[PDB]
Every structure is written in C-alpha cells, then in structure tokens.
Amino acid sequence: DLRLHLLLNTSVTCNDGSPAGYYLKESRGSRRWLLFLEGGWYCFNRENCDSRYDTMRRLMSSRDWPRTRTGTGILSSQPEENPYWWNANMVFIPYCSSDVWSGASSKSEKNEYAFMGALIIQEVVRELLGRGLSGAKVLLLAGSSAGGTGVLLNVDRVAEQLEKLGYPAIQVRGLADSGWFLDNKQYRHTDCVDTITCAPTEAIRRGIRYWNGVVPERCRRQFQEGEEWNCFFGYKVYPTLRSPVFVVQWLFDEAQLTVDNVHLTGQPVQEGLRLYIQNLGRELRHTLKDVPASFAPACLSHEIIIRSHWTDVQVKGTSLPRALHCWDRSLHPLKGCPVHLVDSCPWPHCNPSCPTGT
Ligand SMILES: O=C(NCCc1ccncc1)NC1CCCCC1
Ligand SMILES: *[C@@H]1O[C@H](CO)[C@@H](O)[C@H](O)[C@H]1NC(C)=O
C-alpha cells in the first residue's frame, strides 16, 4: 500500500483549491525513485470544467481521496507482478489539475478554477527531497495517457530543478506511456464549436490560454508565441529534450482513434476505413523510427504500465519489463537485450500477445 501525503505548501492546489498531494511507499534499501503521473483527459473552458466537476470530481479535488492506494503493474512491490523495479521507492501523483500537467495558474477573483499541474510536480519533488530523494541515484518520471504527455512536458524541468537545488548526481529519466499522439488528418471532420466537435489541436490551443499552460523552453523557442500547442505532440517535443526518454505507444491507440472520429462497431470495416487505419499505423511507426528506447505493439488498446498483467505483451519476443531492464543496462547495443521494439505488421491484433479486453 502507498500512503497519502497532502502537500505542506497548501497554495499548490487541485482545480477547486483543495491541496494537491502524492502517495508514497518507500523502500529504505533502494536509491531508485519512480514518480508516476496519472491520466484522464482534461477540460478547457468553464462549461466543460463544470461538467467534469460533477461526474469526475476525484480528477478536480482531493476532498474525497482515500488514505491509501495499492500499487499495480510498474508500481507493484511484488517481483511476480513487477519484474523491472519491484524494490524501488514508489510515488503515485494523482491528476487533479485537468491541464495535461502543464498549468501554472491559481484560483482567484478572475479564475473559477486553479490549473497547477506543472507546479504540483515541482512541489512533490521538493517535499520528497526531505524524505530520502536527496540520496537517489535515478529518478524515473513515468505516466500514462494525459500523464504520459505530462512526462514529455515536465521531465527536463525536474532535471533543471534538481540541478538548481544542488543535486547534480540524481539522474532524471522519463517513461511516457500512451501519450504520443499525431496531429493527423481525421476520418470525419467538424469545426470546433463545442467539446465534442473540437479537434485536439484546437482544444489544446484554447486550454493553454485558459490554464496559463507552460511547455519546455527549447520547444517554445522553436515554435514561438501563440504556437505552444505544437509542444504537446510527442514527435515535435521529443527532439528538444535532453533527459533520456523511453516511449511506450500502442500503434492503434483507442484515444488516438477517438480524436480522429473513428469508432470500431459491429464489424463492417470498408475500404476507406481500412486504408485510414493502415496509414495511421504506418505514420505512428515512422515517428518512432529514430527513437532508440521505445515499445510499440500493433494493438487496439490504451495504457500499459499500471495494469497488473502488463508483462504479457511482447514485441519480437521481448516483454516491456525486459526492454526497460535493457534500457537501464544501456544507461550504465547489448546482445539479446534490445531497447527499440516497434511492430511492423499492419493491422490491430496482428501481434498475438495483444490484450484480449476480457
Ligand atoms: O486528447 C487527448 N487524449 C484523449 C482525451 C479524451 C478522452 C476521452 N474522450 C475524449 C477525449 N490528449 C491530447 C491529444 C493531443 C496531444 C495532447 C494530449
Ligand atoms: C508554495 O508554492 C508557491 C507556488 O509554487 C511558491 O511560489 C511559494 O514560494 C511556495 N511556498 C513556500 C513557503 O515555499
């Protein structure tokens, strides 16, 4: 079990002004620290944030959080379930800022909600340094879905923070799961008039302004004022990052298909949709060709790393916990211990180890 700590700096808050926090299980014999960012969509105006507050409140408030959580998948402390990092210090950071971990704005006379995701990560790191993170050798910032995009936006800021605080020996690394999206041509098209019709590029442009969203400086300098939305797309931000980053991405991610206005239904896939899906997998493989640490199976699914059966999927006969172990060795190519694992078959579930869904 991981135990809840609400932040001591209570000016760093969830959307409704309640304090943010983290869940910690610590491993006193270990100098490895895993900090995991939860996902779960986002909101980008008053009306869609108000609706999220009524039916997704744990993603906007700490008032009802439980005192403990059980670690699963990569957050499990049992080697049977987590062959990779079972003995590490474990931290789960709940997503309660609705801003893809980018925001830097407080609730105030002019702001009904606070969007503090970038500040929440900084404050968790600060408070952990007094609880043993000061002695760390490796800090792995991991996350799934909106949390995986959050890793790409924040990993170099955590590295800079630790340098400026006087901890240059801590090696900061990132693990981005299900957060690598394409700003591609959609299968059907609507102009952005409400939540359901707004494509991701348009919704993120509006969100950055509503949240006071921040992006990595080297990416911001390329795209410049007004164009910061580009830095939310993995293939554009990744080449600007200096910390080592391992990318996990299903080739046919269900969230990518949803934002492309594709809905698998009743089994009748005609030629136009067949070509659309095959081209999506080819484009996503193309973006990963020069990413040396990656795991990209040909499946229709969503998230991997905190699922209890995360070890089952294999690419070319190698599981994700094995590839992450090989990545660790690479940062000390390796015979029989690969780190770049991208499927080449062209259709969902052409890999027999894909999740069934049951
Ligand atoms: O839109 C997303 N994820 C899907 C959010 C979602 C979830 C459930 N229904 C509808 C939408 N992430 C964005 C993509 C563009 C890059 C920055 C993150
Ligand atoms: C609390 O966090 C805010 C926002 O990051 C920061 O400006 C402030 O200095 C912090 N308070 C203390 C006492 O460090």
PDB file of N, CA and C and ligand atoms in Angstrom, residues 41-42 100 149 179 181 200-201 204 232-233 255 258-259, ligand 1:
ATOM      1  N   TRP A  41      -7.901  12.610 -19.500  1.00  0.00           N
ATOM      2  CA  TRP A  41      -8.460  13.695 -20.345  1.00  0.00           C
ATOM      3  C   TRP A  41      -8.049  15.038 -19.728  1.00  0.00           C
ATOM      4  N   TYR A  42      -8.916  16.062 -19.849  1.00  0.00           N
ATOM      5  CA  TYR A  42      -8.604  17.440 -19.449  1.00  0.00           C
ATOM      6  C   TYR A  42      -9.900  18.231 -19.668  1.00  0.00           C
ATOM      7  N   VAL A 100      -3.295  18.548 -18.524  1.00  0.00           N
ATOM      8  CA  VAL A 100      -2.260  17.670 -19.107  1.00  0.00           C
ATOM      9  C   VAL A 100      -0.924  18.008 -18.381  1.00  0.00           C
ATOM     10  N   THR A 149       1.822  12.305 -21.742  1.00  0.00           N
ATOM     11  CA  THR A 149       2.127  13.615 -22.329  1.00  0.00           C
ATOM     12  C   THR A 149       2.768  14.536 -21.272  1.00  0.00           C
ATOM     13  N   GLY A 179       1.030   8.537 -24.430  1.00  0.00           N
ATOM     14  CA  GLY A 179       0.959   9.999 -24.523  1.00  0.00           C
ATOM     15  C   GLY A 179       1.544  10.566 -25.804  1.00  0.00           C
ATOM     16  N   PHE A 181       0.839  11.302 -29.532  1.00  0.00           N
ATOM     17  CA  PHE A 181      -0.264  11.492 -30.472  1.00  0.00           C
ATOM     18  C   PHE A 181       0.189  12.145 -31.773  1.00  0.00           C
ATOM     19  N   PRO A 200      -8.200  17.928 -31.237  1.00  0.00           N
ATOM     20  CA  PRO A 200      -7.158  18.159 -30.225  1.00  0.00           C
ATOM     21  C   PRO A 200      -6.305  19.396 -30.433  1.00  0.00           C
ATOM     22  N   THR A 201      -5.901  19.729 -31.673  1.00  0.00           N
ATOM     23  CA  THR A 201      -5.057  20.914 -31.830  1.00  0.00           C
ATOM     24  C   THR A 201      -5.787  22.164 -31.378  1.00  0.00           C
ATOM     25  N   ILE A 204      -6.414  22.069 -27.361  1.00  0.00           N
ATOM     26  CA  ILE A 204      -5.160  22.372 -26.653  1.00  0.00           C
ATOM     27  C   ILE A 204      -4.785  23.853 -26.801  1.00  0.00           C
ATOM     28  N   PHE A 232       2.819  19.841 -27.346  1.00  0.00           N
ATOM     29  CA  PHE A 232       2.035  18.752 -26.750  1.00  0.00           C
ATOM     30  C   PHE A 232       2.059  17.480 -27.616  1.00  0.00           C
ATOM     31  N   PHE A 233       2.672  17.548 -28.816  1.00  0.00           N
ATOM     32  CA  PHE A 233       2.764  16.413 -29.753  1.00  0.00           C
ATOM     33  C   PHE A 233       4.161  15.806 -29.645  1.00  0.00           C
ATOM     34  N   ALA A 255      -7.484   6.165 -27.788  1.00  0.00           N
ATOM     35  CA  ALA A 255      -7.690   7.615 -27.670  1.00  0.00           C
ATOM     36  C   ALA A 255      -7.348   8.341 -28.976  1.00  0.00           C
ATOM     37  N   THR A 258     -10.318   7.758 -31.224  1.00  0.00           N
ATOM     38  CA  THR A 258     -11.440   8.582 -30.771  1.00  0.00           C
ATOM     39  C   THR A 258     -11.311  10.030 -31.248  1.00  0.00           C
ATOM     40  N   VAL A 259     -10.131  10.642 -31.105  1.00  0.00           N
ATOM     41  CA  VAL A 259      -9.975  12.048 -31.522  1.00  0.00           C
ATOM     42  C   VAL A 259      -9.933  12.185 -33.031  1.00  0.00           C
TER      43      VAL A 259
HETATM   44  O1  LIG B   1      -6.909  14.314 -26.368  1.00  0.00           O
HETATM   45  C1  LIG B   1      -6.127  13.626 -25.704  1.00  0.00           C
HETATM   46  N1  LIG B   1      -6.442  12.420 -25.196  1.00  0.00           N
HETATM   47  C2  LIG B   1      -7.790  11.877 -25.274  1.00  0.00           C
HETATM   48  C3  LIG B   1      -8.734  12.604 -24.344  1.00  0.00           C
HETATM   49  C4  LIG B   1     -10.141  12.065 -24.428  1.00  0.00           C
HETATM   50  C5  LIG B   1     -10.581  11.080 -23.562  1.00  0.00           C
HETATM   51  C6  LIG B   1     -11.879  10.619 -23.673  1.00  0.00           C
HETATM   52  N2  LIG B   1     -12.742  11.077 -24.586  1.00  0.00           N
HETATM   53  C7  LIG B   1     -12.317  12.023 -25.424  1.00  0.00           C
HETATM   54  C8  LIG B   1     -11.034  12.536 -25.377  1.00  0.00           C
HETATM   55  N3  LIG B   1      -4.862  14.016 -25.416  1.00  0.00           N
HETATM   56  C9  LIG B   1      -4.207  15.125 -26.103  1.00  0.00           C
HETATM   57  C10 LIG B   1      -4.047  14.772 -27.578  1.00  0.00           C
HETATM   58  C11 LIG B   1      -3.213  15.812 -28.314  1.00  0.00           C
HETATM   59  C12 LIG B   1      -1.855  15.922 -27.644  1.00  0.00           C
HETATM   60  C13 LIG B   1      -2.039  16.382 -26.212  1.00  0.00           C
HETATM   61  C14 LIG B   1      -2.874  15.378 -25.424  1.00  0.00           C
END
